[PDB]
Amino acid sequence: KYQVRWKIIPYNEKWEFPRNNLQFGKTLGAGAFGKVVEATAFGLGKEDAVLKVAVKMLKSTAADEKEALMSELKIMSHLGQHENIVNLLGACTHGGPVLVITEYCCYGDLLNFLRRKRQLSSRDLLHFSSQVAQGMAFLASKNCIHRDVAARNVLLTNGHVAKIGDFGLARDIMNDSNYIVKGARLPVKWMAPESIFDCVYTVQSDVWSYGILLWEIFSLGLNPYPGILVNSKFYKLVKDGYQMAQPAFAPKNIYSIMQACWALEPTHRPTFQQICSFLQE
Numbered sequence: 642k643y644q645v646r647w648k649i650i651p652y653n654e655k656w657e658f659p660r661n662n663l664q665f666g667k668t669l670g671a672g673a674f675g676k677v678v679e680a681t682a683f684g685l686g687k688e689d690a691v692l693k694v695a696v697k698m699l700k701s702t703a704a705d706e707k708e709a710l711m712s713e714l715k716i717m718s719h720l721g722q723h724e725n726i727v728n729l730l731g732a733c734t735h736g737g738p739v740l741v742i743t744e745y746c747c748y749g750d751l752l753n754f755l756r757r758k759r760q761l762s763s764r765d766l767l768h769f770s771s772q773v774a775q776g777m778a779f780l781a782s783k784n785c786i787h788r789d790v791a792a793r794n795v796l797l798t799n800g801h802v803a804k805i806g807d808f809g810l811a812r813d814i815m816n817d818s819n820y821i822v823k824g825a826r827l828p829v830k831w832m833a834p835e836s837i838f839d840c841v842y843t844v845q846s847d848v849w850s851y852g853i854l855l856w857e858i859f860s861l862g863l864n865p866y867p868g869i870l871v872n873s874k875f876y877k878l879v880k881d882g883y884q885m886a887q888p889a890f891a892p893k894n895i896y897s898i899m900q901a902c903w904a905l906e907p908t909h910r911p912t913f914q915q916i917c918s919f920l921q922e
């Protein structure tokens with residue numbers, strides 16, 4: 642079943658948009674459950690201009706799936722907008738299958754960007770980290786838990802500005818080694834301890850994951866816990882306080898951030914607003 646995991650701790654027709662003003666383009670990414678393509682929206686917004694957007698849609702398998710896409714539409718529509726989230730822009734719930742229109746981020750996902758860049762400056766890596774912390778500060782102010790914070794789940798748009806989102810619809814998580822077949826598909830290398838043992842998720846759980854994400858950014862995109870398998874010995878490791886060593890490109894204070902994010906006690910971790918402030922230095 643398709644499903645996003647943004648959890649807050651029905652539809653406003655003001656978002657509706659005619660699909661006849663929606664001109665499909667190239668497929669950006671396809672999972673088994675649906676796909677996201679790029680398009681052009683004529684008359685979408687106050688400006689009634691032409692903006693290039695991205696449309697999430699399901700395949701042909703229905704209908705508790707259609708329902709999931711709707712629920713995602715409603716959550717996004719409630720959280721409100723923010724300069725560092727991939728924003729809802731509109732939708733098509735009539736005259737055909739549900740289309741969820743969102744912002745198009747031209748430079749693609751952060752992880753790939755980092756990897757074909759192994760030129761960036763350390764000031765760029767700082768901009769990415771800060772921008773994402775600001776998007777995450779926003780989510781938690783809305784009492785929203787992301788539950789899948791990772792570099793793959795950050796996009797870069799104009800001016801290489803970072804926007805966080807959930808893009809599980811457009812890739813194959815069922816066949817992705819970073820997501821474990823526990824049953825649910827869980828990104829265990831990014832998950833805080835309490836999420837792995839007590840199935841507890843909170844805003845501070847996200848902070849942990851943002852720590853691992855920091856590590857991805859300043860290691861220019863290595864897989865976390867390099868050469869270490871997900872299994873019983875692994876759970877004992879992170880439970881016992883094991884932490885990844887400082888990335889080559891990380892400054893000393895940035896690695897301070899990660900270590901704080903990886904506090905074993907959830908309440909010892911910094912909040913996203915605290916993080917945002919130390920990042921602006």
Ligand SMILES: CN1CCN(c2ccc(NC(=O)c3ccc(C#N)o3)c(N3CCCCC3)c2)CC1
Pocket residue numbers: 669670671677695697727743744745746747748749750796806807808809810811812
């Ligand atoms: C030279 N290329 C590299 C990257 N690329 C690219 C552009 C945009 C996106 N995605 C999105 O804008 C977007 C917004 C919301 C969602 C969703 N779901 O996707 C991407 N990807 C494609 C699939 C993973 C998400 C980012 C690549 C196209 C060609």
